[PDB]
Design an enzyme around this catalytic site. Sequence first.
Site, short mmCIF file in Angstrom:
data_model
loop_
_atom_site.label_atom_id
_atom_site.label_comp_id
_atom_site.label_asym_id
_atom_site.label_seq_id
_atom_site.Cartn_x
_atom_site.Cartn_y
_atom_site.Cartn_z
N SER A 1 -9.33 69.60 26.47
CA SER A 1 -9.33 70.63 27.49
C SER A 1 -8.93 69.99 28.80
CB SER A 1 -10.71 71.29 27.61
OG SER A 1 -10.73 72.20 28.70
N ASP B 1 -16.36 77.66 8.52
CA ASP B 1 -16.68 76.53 9.38
C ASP B 1 -15.50 75.61 9.67
OD1 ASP B 1 -18.03 74.42 10.64
OD2 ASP B 1 -19.18 73.84 8.90
#
Length: 330
Positions: free
Chosen positions: A199, A35
């Site tokens: 992004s 994770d």
Amino acid sequence: STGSATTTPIDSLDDAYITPVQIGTPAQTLNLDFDTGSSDLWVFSSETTASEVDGQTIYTPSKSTTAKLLSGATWSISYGDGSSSSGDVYTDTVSVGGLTVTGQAVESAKKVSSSFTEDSTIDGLLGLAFSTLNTVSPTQQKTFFDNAKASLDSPVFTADLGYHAPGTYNFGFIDTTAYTGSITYTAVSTKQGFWEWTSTGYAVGSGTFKSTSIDGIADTGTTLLYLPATVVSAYWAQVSGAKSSSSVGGYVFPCSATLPSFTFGVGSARIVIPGDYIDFGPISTGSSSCFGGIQSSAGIGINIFGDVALKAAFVVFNGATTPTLGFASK
Ligand SMILES: NCCN1CCOCC1
């Protein structure tokens, strides 16, 4: 040194991926969910309440000659999905695909919430976010990557998740055969303890790319792609019959649809998620409706580049003094 281990989807939908991890002496192999959105290595154990164990493999520190109880240390974690677990801490030898860390904190569960008990395939989690999110109290512990970091040939790890197929987690090296084109790196903010980046935009199918900043985290421990409502609505508007459902908890669409791809920007580079990756699966076997692989982050507080997005790329988690994130197409 280096390590290389195969990661496998737990079911036919890629709900999560499990990677075998060796703990103790002699080795006890447990299948952990790696994770990058958390920082605790915790396992189902000989201390876990019997009624809360349903098929998982447990870690028994009394059978490990290298296990050492970390006296006075306890841990308690609550995840974004509402699941939780807590218990005591041991240090033991932990190996992942040939890479060994001695004295790694292994958090032995005494209690796990029902979400964990019902997943017989997940024996615990192996946190790969920054050690500042580790819950061990009062002495915060380091992640497996943080402990391995100095001994690795290069202080990096890579995630190469497969769509309905096995993939790979590598430690200490970059496999140049695992991706097409090049790896584009982008800045990371460690302020919230996550592999948080920005992004440069997105495209829906063959549409024109929209340059727009989207801050988010690269999270291997989250199944789907969670993005702002504006982005998600522009994506699902291209699918006939797509709509947000309150009984299912998000966007559903007719299982009959072939979906458009979704592209996200990494600097001037572009990662294309195929439409099939976004067709997550039927809301039930035989259902008319299918659950979207792209969902709104509106109720979460952060955008999450989960497995739907990460499985479309070769992802480098660069743990140098100033961490960076790399993405390559594959
Ligand atoms: N137990 C509900 C959560 N889990 C998460 C991982 O995949 C299967 C379902």
